[PDB]
């Protein structure tokens, strides 16, 4: 039977590298995912050590070779939320998107490129579903299934080399559009058409989206990466106003 510090580890219905972590003293229920420590240090730890909790990590237990990351259960992701709401009203979209952007700005200011930004990368911290956190543990909205909706112009043009931070901002643009409209801005099921529209920056913002929201979307989905807002700059965009330590313990 699997016991680590004062937690009992139990298999989860899925069981990727994730388990149930029950506190032996109280029955408090967390989640645990195990990683090689090298991988934890390189890919997970940076997120924990930002100044400000954008993750829901409670603590990390560092064994011999492996890191046991204990985190809070979440209350669903933003992909499922948009799907169930169809699309968000501007006031909610702005509240939630500001939390998303604040997370990314923090990351970028410590030289952390995410590279995998999507609505499913953000999850609710409570049952209220008013506060999002970054899914940092590597753990419907198009014409058909499997739209590569986060493909940027850089990744189609250039030669593979481009700005990580500016590519994340493109992803913030796709996310913002999708929050407000309920479909991705580039959503063709035919990849020829999709890639053509992405390279040429061709998408349509419905008329009823406010002027401040429309120019913010446009300011993120600029074809030229150098022309996009930085994540810090997004936080000061007039749209928002218009509508509005993790401990590490060693073990044997």
UniProtKB/Swiss-Prot annotation:
Residues in Protein kinase domain copies: 4-240
Biological processes per GO annotation: negative regulation of JNK cascade; negative regulation of lipopolysaccharide-mediated signaling pathway; negative regulation of MAPK cascade; negative regulation of neutrophil differentiation; negative regulation of smooth muscle cell migration; negative regulation of smooth muscle cell proliferation; negative regulation of transcription by RNA polymerase II; positive regulation of eosinophil differentiation
Tissue: Expressed in most human tissues with the highest levels in skeletal muscle, thyroid gland, pancreas, peripheral blood leukocytes, and bone marrow.
Cellular-component GO terms for this entry: cytoplasm; cytosol; nucleus
Annotated GO MF terms: mitogen-activated protein kinase kinase binding; protein kinase binding; protein kinase inhibitor activity; RNA polymerase II-specific DNA-binding transcription factor binding; transcription regulator inhibitor activity; ubiquitin protein ligase binding; ubiquitin-protein transferase regulator activity
Outcome after substituting residue 245 to A: Decreased interaction with COP1
Keywords associated with the record: Protein kinase inhibitor
Domain of life from the UniProt record: Eukaryota
Subunit structure, interactors included: Monomer. Interacts (via protein kinase domain) with CEBPA. Interacts with COP1.
Record-stated family: Belongs to the protein kinase superfamily. CAMK Ser/Thr protein kinase family. Tribbles subfamily.
Function: Adapter protein involved in protein degradation by interacting with COP1 ubiquitin ligase. The COP1-binding motif is masked by autoinhibitory interactions with the protein kinase domain. Serves to alter COP1 substrate specificity by directing the activity of COP1 toward CEBPA. Binds selectively the recognition sequence of CEBPA. Regulates myeloid cell differentiation by altering the expression of CEBPA in a COP1-dependent manner. Controls macrophage, eosinophil and neutrophil differentiation via the COP1-binding domain.
Name by which UniProt lists this protein: Tribbles homolog 1
Organism: Homo sapiens
Source organism phylogeny: Eukaryota, Metazoa, Chordata, Craniata, Vertebrata
Name of the coding gene: TRIB1
Range within the parent protein: 88 to 364 of 372
């Amino acid at each position: 039977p699997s016991r680590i510090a004062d937690y009992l580890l139990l298999p989860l219905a899925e069981r990727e590298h994730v388990s149930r972590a029950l506190c032996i003293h109280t029955g408090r229920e967390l989640r645990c995912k195990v990683f090689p420590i090298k991988h934890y240090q390189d890919k997970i730890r940076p997120y924990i050590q930002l100044p400000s909790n954008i993750t829901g990590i409670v603590e990390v237990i560092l064994g011999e070779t492996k890191a046991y990351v204990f985190f809070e259960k979440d209350f669903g992701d933003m992909h499922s939320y948009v799907r169930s709401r169809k699309r968000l009203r501007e006031e909610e979209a702005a509240r939630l998107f500001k939390q998303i952007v604040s997370a990314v700005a923090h990351c970028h200011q410590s030289a952390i490129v995410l590279g995998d930004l999507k609505l499913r990368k953000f999850v609710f911290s409570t049952e209220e579903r008013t506060q999002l956190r970054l899914e940092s543990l590597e753990d419907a909205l198009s014409d058909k299934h499997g739209c590569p909706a986060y493909v940027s112009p850089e990744i189609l043009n250039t030669t593979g080399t481009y700005s990580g931070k500016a590519a994340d901002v493109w992803s913030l643009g796709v996310m913002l559009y999708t929050l407000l409209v309920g479909r991705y801005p580039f959503h063709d099921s035919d990849p020829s058409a999709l890639f053509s529209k992405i390279r040429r920056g061709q998408f349509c913002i419905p008329e009823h989206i406010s002027p401040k929201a429309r120019c913010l979307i446009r300011s993120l989905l600029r074809r030229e990466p150098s022309e996009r807002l930085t994540a810090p700059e997004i936080l000061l965009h007039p749209w928002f106003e218009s509508v509005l330590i993790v401990p590490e313990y060693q073990e044997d």
